[PDB]
Amino acid sequence: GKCKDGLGEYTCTSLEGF
Amino acid sequence: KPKLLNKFDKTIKAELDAAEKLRKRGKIEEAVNAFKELVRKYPQSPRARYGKAQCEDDLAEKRRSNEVLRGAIETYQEVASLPDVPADLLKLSLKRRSDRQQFLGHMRGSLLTLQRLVQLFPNDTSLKNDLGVGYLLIGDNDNAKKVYEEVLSVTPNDGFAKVHYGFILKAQNKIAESIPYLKEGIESGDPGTDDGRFYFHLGDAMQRVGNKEAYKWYELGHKRGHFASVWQRSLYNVNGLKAQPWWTPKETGYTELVKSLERNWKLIRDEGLAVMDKAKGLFLPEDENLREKGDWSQFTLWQQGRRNENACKGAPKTCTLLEKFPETTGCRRGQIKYSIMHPGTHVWPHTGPTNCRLRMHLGLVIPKEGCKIRCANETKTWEEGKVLIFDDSFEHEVWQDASSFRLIFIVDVWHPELTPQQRRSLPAI
Ligand SMILES: O=C(O)CC[C@@H](O)C(=O)O
Ligand SMILES: [Mn+2]
Numbered sequence: 001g002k003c004k005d006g007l008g009e010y011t012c013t014s015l016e017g018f
Numbered sequence: 019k020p021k022l023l024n025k026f027d028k029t030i031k032a033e034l035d036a037a038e039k040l041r042k043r044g045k046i047e048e049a050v051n052a053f054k055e056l057v058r059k060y061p062q063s064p065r066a067r068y069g070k071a072q073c074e075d076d077l078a079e080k081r082r083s084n085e086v087l088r089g090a091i092e093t094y095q096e097v098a099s100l101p102d103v104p105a106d107l108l109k110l111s112l113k114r115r116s117d118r119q120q121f122l123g124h125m126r127g128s129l130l131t132l133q134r135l136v137q138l139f140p141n142d143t144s145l146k147n148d149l150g151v152g153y154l155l156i157g158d159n160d161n162a163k164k165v166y167e168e169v170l171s172v173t174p175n176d177g178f179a180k181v182h183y184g185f186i187l188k189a190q191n192k193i194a195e196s197i198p199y200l201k202e203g204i205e206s207g208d209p210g211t212d213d214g215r216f217y218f219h220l221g222d223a224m225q226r227v228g229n230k231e232a233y234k235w236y237e238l239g240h241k242r243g244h245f246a247s248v249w250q251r252s253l254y255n256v257n258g259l260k261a262q263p264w265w266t267p268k269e270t271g272y273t274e275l276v277k278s279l280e281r282n283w284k285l286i287r288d289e290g291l292a293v294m295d296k297a298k299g300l301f302l303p304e305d306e307n308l309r310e311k312g313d314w315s316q317f318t319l320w321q322q323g324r325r326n327e328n329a330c331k332g333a334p335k336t337c338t339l340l341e342k343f344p345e346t347t348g349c350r351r352g353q354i355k356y357s358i359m360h361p362g363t364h365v366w367p368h369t370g371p372t373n374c375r376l377r378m379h380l381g382l383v384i385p386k387e388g389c390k391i392r393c394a395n396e397t398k399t400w401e402e403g404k405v406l407i408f409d410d411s412f413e414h415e416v417w418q419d420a421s422s423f424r425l426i427f428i429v430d431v432w433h434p435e436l437t438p439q440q441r442r443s444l445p446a447i
Pocket of ligand 1: 005357358359365377410414416
């Protein structure tokens with residue numbers, strides 16, 4: 001699930017460390 | 019102060035203290051040698067193994083290398099595998115393992131550790147809260163909900179468990195029920211409750227039910243540093259970028275893109291209408307709970323800076339036209355999509371996730387009356403063959419009360435003040 005028009009997911013990005 | 023040394027570790031506390039001292043003095047490589055030395059000589063020592071892990075952690079920080087940190091994650095696990103591990107050390111080791119797994123994006127691995135932690139320490143309420151986060155991070159809100167329900171069944175005034183339960187409820191469109199949890203959780207002031215997400219969604223929930231106190235919470239969220247303003251409430255922002263709800267083509271500097279869109283608009287329209295007639299399924303219903311009522315669907319060509327090749331089969335000339343403008347086709351925090359909206363549609367006041375994009379609206383099929391879009395405090399209308407531009411990180415609202423359908427073309431662009439390296443590095447949304 002991705003945040004496209006809104007902010008409904010708990011987190012909208014995928015993290016990759018440093 | 020935690021008890022980290024089992025019976026045998028206290029007999030060697032001298033050597034372990036000396037190795038730790040080297041790590042806290044910053045001499046990091048000296049410290050790993052010391053701890054790998056102790057690990058060889060005392061292979062069952064949990065503290066020596068924990069020390070090796072911590073030093074690998076510090077070393078990854080100094081080098082900023084995910085490489086090194088993946089090693090620390092296995093050593094943290096090695097600690098828990100050893101005999102006679104003190105409970106405090108066992109919990110510290112596996113928690114840092116889960117935290118660093120999340121730092122790396124290994125959300126399914128972090129979840130596995132969290133589940134282990136909860137079984138080992140079944141009376142620790144804080145770890146069940148952490149476990150719920152692990153579920154949320156993989157998109158498993160069903161299990162996240164049950165976790166926070168159990169937490170509330172034992173410690174019903176746990177603020178952290180309240181906001182996250184409210185967040186889950188609101189995401190499932192149980193708006194009224196969400197409000198008390200979000201509100202009471204923010205007011206508890208517990209650690210983890212001062213988060214923009216919960217201000218954002220409490221205010222939205224209040225707006226949807228007509229509660230006029232909503233901007234009371236947007237105000238406080240602005241005062242506490244989560245929102246750039248009470249009107250612009252995006253949460254994935256590059257601070258400093260010029261903020262205003264509406265823009266002109268010159269103000270963005272994307273004047274060639276705008277010209278290309280307006281000069282070739284009938285072509286863009288015709289390919290969208292062709293998909294409506296012969297490939298209806300490519301239009302997907304809006305699935306973010308942004309509608310009060312009505313029908314609203316989008317046909318997406320680019321998302322997160324990725325061309326959808328099957329989608330572009332249906333708008334081939336449009337996709338070819340757009341390929342000339344990397345400011346949009348390379349905008350990994352926006353989309354390019356057709357958007358159709360039918361009469362009887364009202365889109366709730368809402369905000370986009372990021373201030374790092376601007377949103378262009380090209381009019382394709384616009385009824386003479388009944389369609390309008392508000393952003394901040396100015397409301398405007400679409401025109402066939404003309405481009406509107408607004409910053410959708412500001413609150414915006416849309417109505418459709420015409421007697422026929424309304425079709426527009428949406429083109430997101432990087433905020434113009436973002437630098438080439440920013441556009442190349444910022445995580446996609
Ligand atoms: O599709 C539309 O009509 C506009 C929707 C609006 O929320 C947007 O982000 O552009
Ligand atoms: Mn929107």
